[PDB]
Amino acid sequence: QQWFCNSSDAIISYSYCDHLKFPISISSEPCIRLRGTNGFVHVEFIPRGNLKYLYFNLFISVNSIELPKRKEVLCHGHDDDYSFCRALKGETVNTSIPFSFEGILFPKGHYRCVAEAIAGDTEEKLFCLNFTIIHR
Amino acid sequence: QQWFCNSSDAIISYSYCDHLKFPISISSEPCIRLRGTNGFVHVEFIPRGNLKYLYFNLFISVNSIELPKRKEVLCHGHDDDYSFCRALKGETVNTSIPFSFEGILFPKGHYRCVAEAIAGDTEEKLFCLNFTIIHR
Amino acid sequence: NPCIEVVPNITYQCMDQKLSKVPDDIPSSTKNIDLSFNPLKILKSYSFSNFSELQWLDLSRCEIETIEDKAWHGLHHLSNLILTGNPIQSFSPGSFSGLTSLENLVAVETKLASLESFPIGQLITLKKLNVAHNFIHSCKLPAYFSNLTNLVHVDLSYNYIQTITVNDLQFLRENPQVNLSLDMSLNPIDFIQDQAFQGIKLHELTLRGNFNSSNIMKTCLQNLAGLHVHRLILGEFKDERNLEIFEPSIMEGLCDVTIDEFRLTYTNDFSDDIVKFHCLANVSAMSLAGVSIKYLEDVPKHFKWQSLSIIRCQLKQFPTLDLPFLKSLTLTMNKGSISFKKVALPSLSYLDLSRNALSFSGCCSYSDLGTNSLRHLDLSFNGAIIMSANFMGLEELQHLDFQHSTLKRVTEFSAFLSLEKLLYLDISYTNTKIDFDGIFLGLTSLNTLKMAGNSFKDNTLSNVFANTTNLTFLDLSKCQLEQISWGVFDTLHRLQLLNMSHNNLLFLDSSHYNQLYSLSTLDCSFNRIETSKGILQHFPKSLAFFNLTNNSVACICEHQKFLQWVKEQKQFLVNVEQMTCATPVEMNTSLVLDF
Amino acid sequence: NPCIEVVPNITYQCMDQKLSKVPDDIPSSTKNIDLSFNPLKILKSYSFSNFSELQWLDLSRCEIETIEDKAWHGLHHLSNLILTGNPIQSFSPGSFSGLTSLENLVAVETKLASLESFPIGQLITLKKLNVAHNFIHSCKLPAYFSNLTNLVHVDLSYNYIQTITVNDLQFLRENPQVNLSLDMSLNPIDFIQDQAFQGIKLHELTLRGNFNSSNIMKTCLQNLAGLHVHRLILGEFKDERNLEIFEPSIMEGLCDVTIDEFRLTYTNDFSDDIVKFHCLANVSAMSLAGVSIKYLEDVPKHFKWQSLSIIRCQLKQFPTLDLPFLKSLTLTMNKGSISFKKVALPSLSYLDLSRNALSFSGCCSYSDLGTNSLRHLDLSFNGAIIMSANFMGLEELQHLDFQHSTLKRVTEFSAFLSLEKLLYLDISYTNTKIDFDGIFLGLTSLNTLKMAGNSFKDNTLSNVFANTTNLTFLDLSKCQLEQISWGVFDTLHRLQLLNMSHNNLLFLDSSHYNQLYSLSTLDCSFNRIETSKGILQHFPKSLAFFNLTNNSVACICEHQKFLQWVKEQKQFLVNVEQMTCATPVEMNTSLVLDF
Ligand SMILES: *[C@@H]1O[C@H](CO)[C@@H](O[C@@H]2O[C@H](CO)[C@@H](O)[C@H](O)[C@H]2NC(C)=O)[C@H](O)[C@H]1NC(C)=O
Ligand SMILES: *[C@@H]1O[C@H](CO)[C@@H](O[C@@H]2O[C@H](CO)[C@@H](O)[C@H](O)[C@H]2NC(C)=O)[C@H](O)[C@H]1NC(C)=O
Ligand SMILES: *[C@@H]1O[C@H](CO)[C@@H](O[C@@H]2O[C@H](CO)[C@@H](O)[C@H](O)[C@H]2NC(C)=O)[C@H](O)[C@H]1NC(C)=O
Ligand SMILES: *[C@@H]1O[C@H](CO)[C@@H](O[C@@H]2O[C@H](CO)[C@@H](O)[C@H](O)[C@H]2NC(C)=O)[C@H](O)[C@H]1NC(C)=O
Ligand SMILES: *[C@@H]1O[C@H](CO)[C@@H](O)[C@H](O)[C@H]1NC(C)=O
Ligand SMILES: *[C@@H]1O[C@H](CO)[C@@H](O)[C@H](O)[C@H]1NC(C)=O
Ligand SMILES: *[C@@H]1O[C@H](CO)[C@@H](O)[C@H](O)[C@H]1NC(C)=O
Ligand SMILES: *[C@@H]1O[C@H](CO)[C@@H](O)[C@H](O)[C@H]1NC(C)=O
Ligand SMILES: *[C@@H]1O[C@H](CO)[C@@H](O)[C@H](O)[C@H]1NC(C)=O
Ligand SMILES: *[C@@H]1O[C@H](CO)[C@@H](O)[C@H](O)[C@H]1NC(C)=O
Ligand SMILES: *[C@@H]1O[C@H](CO)[C@@H](O)[C@H](O)[C@H]1NC(C)=O
Ligand SMILES: *[C@@H]1O[C@H](CO)[C@@H](O)[C@H](O)[C@H]1NC(C)=O
Ligand SMILES: *[C@@H]1O[C@H](CO)[C@@H](O)[C@H](O)[C@H]1NC(C)=O
Ligand SMILES: *[C@@H]1O[C@H](CO)[C@@H](O)[C@H](O)[C@H]1NC(C)=O
Ligand SMILES: *[C@@H]1O[C@H](CO)[C@@H](O)[C@H](O)[C@H]1NC(C)=O
Ligand SMILES: *[C@@H]1O[C@H](CO)[C@@H](O)[C@H](O)[C@H]1NC(C)=O
Ligand SMILES: *[C@@H]1O[C@H](CO)[C@@H](O)[C@H](O)[C@H]1NC(C)=O
């Protein structure tokens, strides 16, 4: 309900989590094709934390078959590649990040990802998002 | 009792085995130094086998502490690097092989190696030798 | 308390409740408050008078628009004051009056407009000052900085600074004794007046993300003549506009600066010739972090680099190096899978090649790294080490570390044989079937073993700790042992921590551990022990900790002596509380028979 | 019998006893004798008359000096006659009379002196003939070879052949239909008369270890003009004198030969330009074995190699190849540790990179090997494979093999997803913690799984065999399982071999295996099973083999029904004989309660 886009082969939709509702705006350009894409992702929010040690926990399910848990480090403090790894709690972040992926085959079905951001220094959750990809 | 040589830092002596006494003459030039050597090894005997699939079993003991068992393939049939891998049972072999080793540190003490040659196709033992290195 | 409390009587987290003033019911003697995102709209006099113990106050996102005169009146020990987000446009004089020990003022995104309209002249203890994201238009340092003696950092990033002049940095020209560290990232700088930096001495100067024309960057960097900086940090950002062509001609102008630590962060386009520029030769500590380098082929031999770090950088081949002055090389977290190659570094004294897929086929030879002065080797988390020598030239190593690197041919001979002075070995999680009793021979000075995921032959702990007297810390967790041989630990007279959890033992014995005089902890959790045979009076009289948890210690009158000893000498055991039994009846702690 | 007997009534090994004649007490109807090293000194007439069934006779090292007339009189089925070592200098006529089916005469080191003084003209079935080490001085093939129709190999190695002439090889000029395979290794050849080989057609020609002057080798090889050989094998030996300089100028003269399979064995000095010689372009199957090559950089694109093998050869880098006609590449047992690199082989159909330390970081992409026709991939015994793609272009692979290669990121996603037609997968001993139920998805045609040293999560066999209906062979030994989940094997209707030995099971159930209709073997040795819960009438009525050995099946009236079924339906169990029990009393087989 928060946001969604329809691509040629994918339908991507996100909503807020249930135990954390901290506002965040996020979108992409163009709508991701699971057949390989190249583009940008636009982020706009106000850090509920220091963003200096930011990482993610992803709980992924492919057709109701829980994958293991992934942990992706985005910032680590020592000369990060990103300008928003310098923000502070209360300082509006508004940025655009490029990406590209091609060469993987994904099954048809229905995926789900619970994506929760953690401030690694004090271990509090900045936000939680509830994703939904439908690949056709 | 069969043969021995004295080097600067090593004393090497060999005798026959107990359950196999098949004649074989073997020596080296020069007497091996465990401090790294480069030279030749001279072999003279009459194959009690076909020598086409020849390998060794080495039972090594360093100061009465049995190492695991080593298996070294010498011939394997398909275009071996050695001219005697072509001999036949009854055909006198008389050859000289070069070697070189440097860069390992060996403890002081007393080593023993039971070295038994096997014809890999029919699994009979060609000969068995009882070695003795004393490193000082 | 309309707000949460973290710690009893201290640390009252009161974030995000609909508040319009400080709660009065907050107990005094607190040390940390947090009034964030509360819809305050004005500070009022004496509001914090009662909190005369507060040393950490946060007011972020509050809608604070004005400030009364004696606002921070009773605050005497407040060290940190954060004011991010509050649209306090005009800081009228008299603000920050009562504060006498403020060491860290954060004023990010408070619609500030200049450093002179900032009444902080009296804060004579201000260590740091952060005014990022604040509409500022000029680098001019006001004169009142002469009062702030202990000021060591200023952050002006993400402002509207446009040009630099010679009357700026004047306070730095009159005072050659200030240890100031500037920062001007993300400022659209285009014009540096000539002779601007002259007789200046900064301790750090960040310039990431400033310029977007190779021409403008070249000219501006050229006008840096005369600067004397202890750490110059350059580069770009990934989510920003940036140079599309980068050439060593840009580094012109830097040829008369006096850099002492040249750091070069991420760069969009990167040609390997940059590091081969003739006026980096006096840099004392080179460093790259995130640059998309491919080949570091050959650098001149008159370079005076005493250090070199290459972190997170791509590489297609192990670099070729012959610097005669370099020490402390570091190549960590490399993006590719490379294979080691011989180098020649006569002055190397610290190596660190961790977290790469460094597959290092040949091994431990002086011929590999030409240095008779190595002291810290680290090859952890790598691909596949293959041992084929006894470290014949590296007899000074004091710190060795394999931690997730497949370590081969370590049991086939007495490796580690020449390391007569080594203090910290670590071979954990290197799949290493110990089946030879001379593997740890020669390590007469070791103090710390760490082996966890390493099996044994017969699942039996052989006698592999002879001539290892000085071992003080030992770790054997997660090995799949099933018994301990007789005679081990007979000479480990100084061991103080013995770890054995997560094994597959069945019983326990006290004939062991009888010589462990100075032992202090004997963690044996999770390892399925049912009893303790042997006389139980032979444990050492120095043990302080005994983990006997998650076992199946049986209490069906099995060894009544032990079932009594376990609940008698329990001032040492850990969590004696939940000691369940595993033979019906379970859910118990004491056995009926006493003494 | 003064001599040993191997097999009852056959195969009477009588080697090395002090004998002076054939023992008379040897039973007839034997098929194999061996009279080796016995001090016979003369063969006598009719001595073998009784043995009219012998088809393998060895007389090695005997001191046989002469031979009587009707020596091999009664021999009618002797296929192989070995005479190595016997100093029979003169083979007077009439020898080899009675033999009418001799297919393999070995006459090594019998002091022979020429091929003409060899009365074998009547042996019209002689397949092979070996006269190595025999003082011969000339390659002249005698005319009586016209009689020996089925002669396909002659071995003249280690003789005194010195020169070759045109009147030799005349029998080969008059008869273009003989399929002869020569061999002249270790012969000091120095002069080949001009026009010697002309209109000749050999099937093989070995020349290893002949020449020692780059000049003499060049000239002699040049005189090979006109030859048409199906397999030319060149090289040297390690324990012999050999060329000290080797250059592509030597390969001159070979430019007008008609080689079909150029094999090049060990060579002392080797320059990488040899394989880049302009007159190998028509060779159909190149092959190297033991050459100390370093770089195979770039070969021309008009080469017509349809195959290429590089075995036991050193290498410092994965070769760079773009041959458009090459298929069936093979690079095995390489002496170094190399990393894979992209190639472009549009006609490749067979790859084999086993036994190397091929660390193949990127993985399974069409971009890696440009071939839409791969059918046999083999990366076994390698260093560390890293999966990062689903074999997106290789949808024809029918044979895949990882056997001791550390296989990473195989569980993190559904690998093997595009291999819709694969028959033989093998991932044994690749340390692979199966913790995902979609790992084997897409393999709808698999017939053979092989996983041995692979653990699970919870030590519990999850449901990982859905959509794998056609699996016929399955292997799960050596996994450290501790139970089987409910629901597995519910669709493996065609499985015929289920392996589970060496596990850590505790009991056994029959609710499983109820759908395994066509099962035939259920090896469950060594896995510590005590009983069999569930109705025992639900096993399939096709099982033929049941391994229940080295268990601790208890017989303390524990499940009396099972203790009866185990000794009743035992015409299927394996080694029912030594079925010990493990609850006092042990050493038993039957329980008292019947029916
Ligand atoms: C100038 O101020 C800087 C800022 O703190 C001082 O730097 C610290 O020095 C200590 C000891 O070397 C380091 O552990 C810190 O990491 C440094 N901080 C940073 C980020 O620079 C510096 O020491 C001061 N100069 C002098 C001469 O004392
Ligand atoms: C000429 O004789 C050779 C010698 O046996 C024949 O070679 C065998 O052929 C079979 C089938 O191709 C192979 O499996 C063997 O390995 C070959 N032996 C060797 C070592 O060459 C050859 O087939 C004969 N020529 C013809 C046309 O039949
Ligand atoms: C299951 O795999 C095991 C591997 O452990 C096979 O075990 C071999 O069994 C034979 C007896 O038939 C022994 O002589 C070997 O020693 C065993 N292998 C090892 C490595 O010890 C077993 O045969 C397999 N089961 C089936 C039915 O094939
Ligand atoms: C258990 O018994 C079975 C059946 O006798 C053994 O299976 C044979 O094993 C050999 C060697 O692995 C194979 O070559 C045969 O094909 C197998 N026969 C069949 C049809 O299963 C098995 O090896 C024995 N297992 C153990 C561990 O002793
Ligand atoms: C995500 O949303 C689904 C409904 O679409 C819900 O069932 C699930 O619990 C949500 N995840 C979390 C972590 O709340
Ligand atoms: C965020 O920045 C973009 C420029 O990248 C700008 O277009 C956008 O308006 C900004 N967001 C807001 C809320 O102004
Ligand atoms: C080798 O010789 C020693 C005596 O020197 C003897 O004890 C040992 O048994 C011999 N080895 C064998 C295999 O006979
Ligand atoms: C063995 O060959 C060598 C030449 O390498 C020779 O000197 C020696 O005499 C030969 N052996 C005998 C017993 O003649
Ligand atoms: C903190 O304050 C409360 C209320 O004034 C008091 O009961 C308590 O004893 C104080 N100390 C602690 C440690 O809670
Ligand atoms: C300080 O505490 C006293 C007594 O608890 C209270 O009456 C007073 O209001 C407090 N100060 C302020 C500014 O509220
Ligand atoms: C420092 O503060 C004092 C206040 O006591 C003031 O008189 C003086 O002018 C200040 N210094 C500067 C350089 O303004
Ligand atoms: C650098 O970027 C700014 C921001 O878009 C742009 O206005 C300016 O023109 C650029 N520089 C040049 C030389 O064009
Ligand atoms: C600094 O380096 C330059 C060359 O880049 C050199 O000419 C100069 O002498 C160096 N300064 C020293 C050595 O003090
Ligand atoms: C090493 O230990 C052995 C006992 O196995 C002992 O004989 C030897 O002297 C020791 N070497 C030392 C202490 O250098
Ligand atoms: C072989 O010969 C012996 C003695 O003539 C005879 O007893 C035996 O039955 C024969 N067959 C076998 C299989 O031993
Ligand atoms: C053949 O067998 C018969 C009877 O066993 C025996 O008398 C005769 O001597 C044998 N032949 C020879 C040549 O010994
Ligand atoms: C072949 O053998 C026969 C004996 O029947 C002989 O007459 C003939 O001459 C032989 N052939 C040749 C070419 O010698």
Ligand SMILES: *[C@@H]1O[C@H](CO)[C@@H](O)[C@H](O)[C@H]1NC(C)=O
């Ligand atoms: C080749 O080796 C033989 C054997 O020693 C030697 O007599 C001959 O002279 C060598 N060739 C040349 C051209 O010298």
Ligand SMILES: *[C@@H]1O[C@H](CO)[C@@H](O)[C@H](O)[C@H]1NC(C)=O
């Ligand atoms: C054989 O190769 C040569 C070049 O080495 C070439 O000139 C000739 O045409 C080839 N023979 C063919 C293609 O039949």
Ligand SMILES: *[C@@H]1O[C@H](CO)[C@@H](O)[C@H](O)[C@H]1NC(C)=O
């Ligand atoms: C794979 O198995 C699932 C059950 O987990 C089933 O729903 C799906 O249809 C199967 N896919 C096939 C047979 O292609």
